[PDB]
Amino acid sequence: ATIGRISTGSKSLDKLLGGGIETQAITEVFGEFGSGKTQLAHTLAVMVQLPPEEGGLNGSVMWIDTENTFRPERIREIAQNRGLDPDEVLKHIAYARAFNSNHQMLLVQQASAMMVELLNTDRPYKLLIVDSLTSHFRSEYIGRGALAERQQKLAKHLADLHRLANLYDIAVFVTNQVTLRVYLRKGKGGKRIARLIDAPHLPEGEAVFSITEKGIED
Ligand SMILES: [Ca+2]
């Protein structure tokens, strides 16, 4: 399968990422609360549903939520401001709340069966969001005696996510706090800045973007 790319909505950020977030990859976006990481997840959940000429992959979305960050009204807003049907865009997002780290791991293992079901349809899954990758692991595995089990379980979880990305030709997008690593920070005037770091086949760099009624854009 040739790698597909989903536009972030920001031309500057897309350029930094080599065209958009990639299928067959995990993109891991770091930042503090309000940094833009969750706004970017909501934007991508709309963009991926568009045709390739408009920056999408005609795809369905799966959203695994660990910190109650998914906002259906934000999806509706982004969809409408981009001239799309809000009800239709929302219907193509399969939402699952993860109650703890073990459940989060199970949901990703169970996702394989769901991906197979839409694989040869008009709207195969093309994007899996995990917002956030680590909140449950950090809340549950505190201190020295818990570190080994936490790193082993997180490494297994990441392997399971990579397997989904590669087997079903989807982009996996996950958020984190301090894979293709992007770090977000506050810029000037409410702008946000993304920095791509340690990418094997993309140079490091930065992109400035805005959060608007359309989600993310330059
Ligand atoms: Ca955010």
Residue numbers in the entry: 108 to 285, 310 to 349
Q: What is the paper's account of this structure, in its own sentences?
A:
The structure of HumRadA2 also highlighted the need to introduce further mutations at the back of the Phe pocket (particularly V232Y216) in order to force I169M158 and K221M210 into the same conformation as observed in the HsRAD51:BRC4 complex. Overall, the structures of the humanised RadA proteins are very similar to each other, and significant differences can only be seen in loops that are involved in either crystal packing, or are mobile and poorly defined.
